[PDB]
Amino acid sequence: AVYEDQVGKFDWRQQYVGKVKFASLEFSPGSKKLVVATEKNVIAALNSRTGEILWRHVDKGTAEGAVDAMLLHGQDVITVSNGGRIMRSWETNIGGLNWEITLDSGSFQALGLVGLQESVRYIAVLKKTTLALHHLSSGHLKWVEHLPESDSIHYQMVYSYGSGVVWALGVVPFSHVNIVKFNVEDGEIVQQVRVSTPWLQHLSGACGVVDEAVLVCPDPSSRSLQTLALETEWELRQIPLQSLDLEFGSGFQPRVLPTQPNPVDASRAQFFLHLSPSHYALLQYHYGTLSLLKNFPQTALVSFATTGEKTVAAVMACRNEACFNQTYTINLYLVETGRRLLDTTITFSLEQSGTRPERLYIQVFLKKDDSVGYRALVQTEDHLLLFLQQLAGKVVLWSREESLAEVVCLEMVDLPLTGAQAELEGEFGKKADGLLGMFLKRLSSQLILLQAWTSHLWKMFYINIDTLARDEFNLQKMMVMVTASGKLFGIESSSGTILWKQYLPNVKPDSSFKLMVQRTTAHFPHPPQCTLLVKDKESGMSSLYVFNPIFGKWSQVAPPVLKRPILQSLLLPVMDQDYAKVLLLIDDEYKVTAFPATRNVLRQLHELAPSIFFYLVDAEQGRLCGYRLRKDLTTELSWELTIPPEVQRIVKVKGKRSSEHVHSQGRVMGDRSVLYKSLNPNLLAVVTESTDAHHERTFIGIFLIDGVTGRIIHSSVQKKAKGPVHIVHSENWVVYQYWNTKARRNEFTVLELYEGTEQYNATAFSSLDRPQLPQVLQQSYIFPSSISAMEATITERGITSRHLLIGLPSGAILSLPKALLDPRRPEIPTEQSREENLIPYSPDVQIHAERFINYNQTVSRMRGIYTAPSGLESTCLVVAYGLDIYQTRVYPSKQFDVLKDDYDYVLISSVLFGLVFATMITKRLAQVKLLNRAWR
Amino acid sequence: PELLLDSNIRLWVVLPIVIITFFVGMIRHYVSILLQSDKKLTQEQVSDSQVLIRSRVLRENGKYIPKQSFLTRKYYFNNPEDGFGNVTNVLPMILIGGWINMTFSGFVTTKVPFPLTLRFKPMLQQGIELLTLDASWVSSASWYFLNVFGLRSIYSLILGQDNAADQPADTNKAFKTEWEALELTDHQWALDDVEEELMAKDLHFEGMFKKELQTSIF
């Protein structure tokens, strides 16, 4: 921003983290922290009192930043990431870093923590070939050993305790299983044991270790459990469940959940058994005997915790039933004996219709009355985090909507016209009777206006969805956000408060979304209407969803059923009798479907068919096609182009925004002459990248084509260049950025189109009647940074100057004037250049901190920038969405339309009064002087 | 129309310019009257000026006296006689223009109701920085100058005569000039045929014995 005074008056930022993958809550707990890691390769520490962020670290967005393993120890966190390559020790208290090291090659299998003599001092890392022990204080390697027979035996588990030895377990499915015991002090292979299991196939996700290092696995085929004491046994012991009278589910994988609160001592003798979906059993093992401590049928989730010497389990289920009211209850149980702890039940509910929780993490503490209080952290199905406490009316402490970290679409709809004036339109300015009526009603209106004015001055000394009304300047709108998880949000654009929410069931992670505003709020008897198109990635099925932009409720009009995959869509400007723009969909069989398919719309399309064209681009084969609509809503092939994929591949295709207006139809270079622009409204810019990745044979191709006929207006190739490419194509120009390898720098390139000196036709623009190619001017510049996003500002009439908003990787957003990137700038200054007032060419563009539109509200991992006109000729609304969301407003031309906020009324009144006083005094003095001069 | 304007700018930027320029003009007029001048002339100057005026009046109206008197006066005047402040007026205009440009420029003020050409644009848009805006829209300084120029008639009307706005050498030389000018004048009596003109018609005794003889005051 500017002036350091409007800070926080117009802009706002919201920060987010991705979907939780690992969490850790056990702490002092005098310090209130919650260390979390998400699926967006980001690790953060959230405050538990409120839910804010204390510190956050963001890694690479690609697969080279995924977190593989996470552990906690005292006040430190240990992370293994980058496909089992990098290990880090985060200091939780300050948010810095203790150390970071690189492991050897291989695939990560498991991470463990070991110790000796009641003191943990080492970290154990397991890879498909080797096992390594490193120091914990400094991270220096202690030793590495090679797992025997690693070629065929897949090692999957690591277990140890304060004894002084370390086990490693490997399996071959339906085959022998091997256990190798090493010693911590030096690292010799001191024991090896082999057994045969022709019935199991997995070890990591099904087996467990309980008590004094006793392995336990389930077997549904044999309908029993198998146990082996790793210390003093070399044969499996089978135990049937008919004694405890259980039953494994059909076609389900049972699980064993042990616990080990302290890595030094042995594990607890009690463990959970996940038997069937929503079926658990808390059992206790003692010398080859299993005791049914408790069973839990029809339960949702279970979890463990431990404080001091008390180990406590937490069970979450639902009351009535596909639960009835989406209402769930959480209860606390003692682990030593199956027993509820009274006065511990927590009841909560979910607002959405078809959601359900998936994770449960519990933090426990000891109360003053020697009781066990606790709090829970619940993640739902739609990426919603809730922090529940143990109160009565404040069961929910705080919540976070983490689905807003993957926004894929965005629209702005202006609020409906104020009811006090929308309905006043009918009663005001309405013809009633002859010449004697309108003036009488006008004077009555003036009288009531006077009464209102008197009422307003009498009191000088004495957010709801249905009360929303638009501002006089229309500077407040209704943001509509669509998230990759399948959730729609309706948010106020002035303070960023969620006004409504909606959920779409069964949305695949990699679908394709596209929404268009059909009907706005300019027709009171009809409701505003928006449409959303969702296409499945794999099956190819496509669906439509019609809703209200203001309230979020589904509309009564049922959208049609798309029996064929949808190839593309189009939004005509033709309005039905209900003022709804007609939408066309072209499917896989090249026949179009209209919506709404009313009789009037059908007749209009029957009349206007030969003036609508479709163009389709296939990047896999590099084939472009163009069809023309026929009378009966059928299509016929018109033009076709091919680009060989073995040399180039298409990466982008850009067209001009359909809601923009160009003000001037020509440019004046002086000396009483005009240079006319070539404003083709159907031009397409296509960017292709070479398939040769060598640093001396790579290039980027640019094609300017006509969408109707298919003429290639322009072809160009830039050599020694590499992607990614960011391109902006606007009213008359194209600006694209790239990376140059011979000099290793980022470069801008600007192309500008001009016509001759006389207009070919000033009445219309038909693409079938333009037989003369335009004139292309090109230039290039050097940009000393990288780019994460690019966009161009918009305005109502296109009178203000055009600026480019550029999103850098650091987080800032730069506003670069377009007049700086002009191909007509001369290298050698001349008199004509002076009379045109053109700056001489300079090869470098500089970045200044004063040009940032966000002072320090940085946006991390930026992905999109959106601009809106906002019903005023000097202000544009900007929304930048990446991991974070930022909203502000910009004035390219210093806001010539609204009076400055620093107007000094007092000075104006004082100067007016002084002028009046001086006038009076001077008049008196002049009169007296004349009178005295008359009388000598 | 094209643009949407805030009513506050109309309420607080338009009227003050007019009020300020009006009262500045009035103050300038009154101050100019206050210290207009103070001139003093010696006796010889006024005496010679009155003599010159008398000679001019003789030359102009010698045709209403008998020729002998005219030539008697013409024998005279030939042998014996002929031969023997702003700084405050202009500087405050520029100063006030500069002050107004300093403390008011930066927004659109108003629009003229008739179309213009591109020639008008550089004059009426001193403050704004747009490029393709029409020439009808004006800035604050142009409005101030227009208001200044369009008040001469109002000042002449509401104030006495005309003000509050911007726009002998040698006695002997004058004596010689009047001597040369008078020498070529000759008497032409205007009473030669007055009687015949009188005798043409009866006297106009109509509308003379109306009303009534006055009795007292009022």
């Binding site: 296409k535 190839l567 189009l570 609508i612 409204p681 | -």
Partner: peptide
């Protein structure tokens, strides 16, 4: 006498409509 009347040149209008892009 050119370079004038330019501000009075109202823009023309489209004759066709086209939309699409990469396959959805």
């Amino acid at each position: 006498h050119a370079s004038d009347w330019l501000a009075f040149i109202e823009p023309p209008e489209r004759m066709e409509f086209s939309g699409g892009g990469l396959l959805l």
